């Protein structure tokens, strides 16, 4: 098949809830991936793919580092 809308698997609003919930949860699971997807019109696979790409991008950006 193919996509019903011209989107890069996310919207400019969904990406904000993903990078916000990434602050409270750095490693979501089947239950927590669904918890964020449920009110953002996503599925757990979109969340898993996004967090996988975000960890790979975080390491170039150094968005969080432990200072202790």
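Q: What amino acid sequence fits the structure above?
A:
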């Amino acid at each position: 098949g193919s996509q019903r809308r011209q989107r890069t698997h996310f919207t400019s609003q969904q990406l904000q809830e993903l990078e916000a919930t990434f602050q409270r949860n750095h490693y979501p699971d089947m239950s927590t991936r669904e918890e964020i997807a449920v009110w953002t019109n996503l599925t757990e696979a979109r969340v898993r793919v996004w967090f996988k790409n975000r960890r790979a991008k975080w390491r170039k950006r150094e968005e969080f580092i432990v200072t202790d």
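Q: And what stands out in the fold?
A: The first helix runs from residue 14 to 24.
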